[PDB]
Amino acid sequence: TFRRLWPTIAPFKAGLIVAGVALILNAASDTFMLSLLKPLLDDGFGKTDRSVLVWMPLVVIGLMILRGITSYVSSYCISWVSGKVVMTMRRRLFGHMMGMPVSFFDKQSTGTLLSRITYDSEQVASSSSGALITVVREGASIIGLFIMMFYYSWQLSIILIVLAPIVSIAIRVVSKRFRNISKNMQNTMGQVTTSAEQMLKGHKEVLIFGGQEVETKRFDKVSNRMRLQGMKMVSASSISDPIIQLIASLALAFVLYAASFPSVMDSLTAGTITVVFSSMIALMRPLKSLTNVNAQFQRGMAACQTLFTILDSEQEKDEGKRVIERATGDVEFRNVTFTYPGRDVPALRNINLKIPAGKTVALVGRSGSGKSTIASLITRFYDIDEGEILMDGHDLREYTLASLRNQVALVSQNVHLFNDTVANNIAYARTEQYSREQIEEAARMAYAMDFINKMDNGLDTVIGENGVLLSGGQRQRIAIARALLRDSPILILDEATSALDTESERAIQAALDELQKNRTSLVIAHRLSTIEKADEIVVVEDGVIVERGTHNDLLEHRGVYAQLHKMQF
Amino acid sequence: TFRRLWPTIAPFKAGLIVAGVALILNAASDTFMLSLLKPLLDDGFGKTDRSVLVWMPLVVIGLMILRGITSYVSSYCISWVSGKVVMTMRRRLFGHMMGMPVSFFDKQSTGTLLSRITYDSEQVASSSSGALITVVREGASIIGLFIMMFYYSWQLSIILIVLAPIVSIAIRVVSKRFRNISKNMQNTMGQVTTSAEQMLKGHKEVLIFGGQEVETKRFDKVSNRMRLQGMKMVSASSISDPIIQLIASLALAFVLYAASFPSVMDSLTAGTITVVFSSMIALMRPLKSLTNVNAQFQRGMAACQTLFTILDSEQEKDEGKRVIERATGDVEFRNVTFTYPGRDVPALRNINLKIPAGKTVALVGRSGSGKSTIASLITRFYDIDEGEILMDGHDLREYTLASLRNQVALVSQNVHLFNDTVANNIAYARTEQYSREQIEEAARMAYAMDFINKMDNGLDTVIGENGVLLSGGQRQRIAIARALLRDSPILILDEATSALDTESERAIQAALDELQKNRTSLVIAHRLSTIEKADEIVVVEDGVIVERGTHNDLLEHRGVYAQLHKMQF
DSSP: OOOOOHHHHGGGHHHHHHHHHHHHHHHHHHHHHHHTHHHIIIIIIIIOSSSHHHHHHHHHHHHHHHHHHHHHHHHHHHHHHHHHHHHHHHHHHHHHHHHSOHHHHTTTSHHHHHIIIIIHHHHHHHHHHHHHHHHHHHHHHHHHHHHHHHHHOHHHHHHHHHHHHHHHHHHHHHHHHHHHHHHHHHHHHHHHHHHHHHHHHTHHHHHHSSOSHHHHHHHHHHHHHHHHHHHHHHHHHHTHHHHHHHHHHHHHHHHHHHHSSSSSSSTTOTTHHHHHHHHHHHHHHHHHHHHTHHHHHHHHHHHHHHHHHHHHSOOOOOOOOBOOSOOOSOEEEEEEEBOOTTOSSOSBOOOOOEEOTTOEEEEOOOSSSSTTHHHHHTTTSSOOOEEEEEETTEETTTBOHHHHHHHEEEEOSOOOOOSSBHHHHHTTTOTTTSOHHHHHHHHHHTTOHHHHHHSSSGGGSBOSTTTTOOOHHHHHHHHHHHHHHHTOSEEEEOOOSOOOOTTTHHHHHHHHHHHTTSSEEEEOOOOHHHHHHOSEEEEEOSSSEEEEEOHHHHHHSOTTHHHHHHHHO | OOOOOHHHHGGGHHHHHHHHHHHHHHHHHHHHHHHTHHHHIIIIISSSOSHHHHHHHHHHHHHHHHHHHHHHHHHHHHHHHHHHHHHHHHHHHHHHHHHSOTTTOSSSOHHHHHHIIIIIHHHHHHHHHHHHHIIIIIHHHHHHHHHHHHHHOTTHHHHHHHHHHHHHHHHHHHHHHHHHHHHHHHHHHHHHHHHHHHHHHTHHHHHHSOOTHHHHHHHHHHHHHHHHHHHHHHHHHHHHHHHHHHHHHHHHHHHHHHHHSSSSOOOOTTTHHHHHHHHHHHHHHHHHHHHTHHHHHHHHHHHHHHHHHHHHSOOSOOOOOBOOSOOOSOEEEEEEEBOOTTOSSOSBOOOOOEEOSSOEEEEEOSSOTTHHHHHHHHTTSSOOSEEEEEETTEETTTBOHHHHHHHEEEEOSOOOOOSSBHHHHHTTTOTTTSOHHHHHHHHHHTTOHHHHHSSSSGGGSBOSTTTTOOOHHHHHHHHHHHHHHHTOSEEEEOOOSOOOOTTHHHHHHHHHHHHTTSSEEEEEOOOHHHHHHSSEEEEEOSSSEEEEEOHHHHHHSOTTHHHHHHHHO
């Protein structure tokens, strides 16, 4: 179909043409190797015992080294072109995916995105390359073989290529005849098989009533029936091979009959004949290879259409351009009803949550639905389905997206530390902005210096995966250091599970207290200490804040907070 | 492979020998077909003679008729041998399967039982036949071709065939080297792809921070890897290809060098070298095929061992020599504990149920746990796990199985009607015992003659599957007719469906009352009318005989019968 990746491969058209010429020369070497038979057959043997036959080994070994060099060069160059186009496709796909919304990553198919970016892309490249090399090198081979046949024997090729379609239509009609006979009788085969099945399904009924002698006689008759049907199957299927071989040898016999001396043929054959036949029994292979070229090309184009469908999806909407340097103004959720995309049930109904500036507000809901959703809603990682999230006098939609990202920071047990040095991870995308001294001080006041000093290289050790592979609490402290260096006016604190890690829960809690001394703290902690520390506490059963107030006030108004507090202890 | 099984195939040895000689002749056909080449080439065209060329087409086409006839005869005769082996194997398998215990019919795999009857029985014969044709035909071709090489060239054959394994080991070591390189490279590729996967899964945390170029740049570096590493996939593999070709052509050079460099060889004429090379390339195939003979043989022998194990498995136990003409005595359980084989939970604990002679007992239970298994137990489908069943003062295990099975008769909504005529189905395995007049008398007394009266051919119509396809209520009517003709002293009724068919339920109930007017009859049933009509009513919830007494008494004492009276309405 329509491919618009040609501008991608246009800069590398030179390498592609070099690969094509290499494949042309490869096919030329192969067909010249085939044509090498005739001088060998005539002069090498018939004329003399020794003469041409000494030159020919050198000629064929030379042709083979030429063929190998051409094949290797073509493979290397087409690999270069494929690698470059797949390089461009991969980086374009990832660049789009950077700004592309969370919706595809919202469990649409996360594991298959890896396939899309690597396996399907290289499948597109390999399919296109395979189609190109196949069509060019097999067209070259076909042209070379045809010119060989016409040059060596002008009159033999026309009769033989006239005969070949006749044999083709004969083979097709015979195969169709025997295939439909086969399936037509296989219907009866299935009938008898079902008869035997129903016969044996009455095992209890046979056992209870009478004996098996009548049953054995019935199975004997049915067995004889399927045995004769199997006779018919094997006979009908086996007679195909004699018939097809007979047709092929009839074609050969007619060819030889034409080769019988008249005035047309045999004037110039000598040992030519085998060469012609050799070429034909070679020529049958590329044409078959040429049959699948279109199918392979269509498969590659379908994969490329999938990739283009991924690419053409709209990026994250960022129409709002209002900028905000510091977000000291409070956050205000006002009757904000959110629905998860792909989820029929409303994830979050209208909620009037207030988050005053420089205060601790704690989400204490235990239902597990909507608790982490608000952390995404405050950050425009999902669209605002309904209601207004007004921060510092303006709604989140109006604000520049990148602004809202840098203003807010979130720290959780789950944190994807990037494959880099710890110092670079501490200031992601801000290493130019933040000095190494600032990074060290941030790690110090986050109480993570023990973990950095533990590793040999320290501030430059590769903390990412396939590197240090540090423990989860250490990842949390790295994240707290990231937020602390950023000094985000708005902090989100998930704390999914409160683990009293030895020698580390005290340090991480101290770091949490250090970070949340100032700035708003939207905390989803299951730890009772943070809940008590919260200036306000909210419990939401996915619809609305059932209870609002202090933890003691929420204890006074039991509702659902009482049993929740029982699980807290 | 300790298959043995030869007594089965011994009487059909003559067909096997005829197939073998025909197949050897078929291989000799190919040998002589290639032998025709040297007269066709050396003395056909290079020679000025004409008639020798006209000789070839007729002889090759007649050779092809010989090949086709030999192939057809071989296929037909080995089909005969295979069909007879399958005949005896299927017969001896099905006889044992009917003799196999009901515990073998454990619902383990009902369709694979047919597969053993159909798929595995044909697999053993097909595999044995394939191994036979492969070894005989391909070995005949191999030995004939070697005789060819030694006949046409006493010298070139030995050098070519001693050089061939050298080329084989060279190909093996080179291919193994490249495969090892590629294989250990695959692990590096797998490791590299994990970096891209990690960066992709980290989108959730890329977006909150600045991300952007520091992501893409990093990805770009990783993007280069599967290009460069990707080149190592295609580069090395590519340079694997011509090298294995090159050395092969080097061998093709060497023999050709040996064609001329000696002053001794000097005896190839023109076509004999072509005959030798053609015979080599035509020999490569049968050597490959002959390598797979052991695999086919062992696979077929494994399927044969499955069938042999099924045949050798112990039948239903028949260690009872006590014979009863008519079971006029009472049937009674004494603390009979039963467990389904393959089930850990005791299906039925100890039960001491007594059934007086003549009187009717009903079993009631919604879930059916424990209720249904008893009706099978009295027929010795599943042997007792513990306890004893006293029939006429002796144990059922003591009684002869075939003798007992005639005493009790089963009636249910689901009855496997055999594909014979209605008259046979009424007197299955008893058509000689009872007269046709008795059969129609039983049909009339069953009060279901009408459905058979309106039937086209009357009592002689094929009634089972691939026939009239009778209705399930009418199947139950046929069963009540079966019992009427048998006049079994013991009756078990299932009555699971409890279907109130219009005008057929009434006749069914009338027939049930007619049959159970006399003789012992226990009835599982959800019908309140039948439960009331029962002389005794029993409720079993898989644990114990919960309630014993009349239905009014079982209503007076709540227990569980009241809950049954709820949905009996």
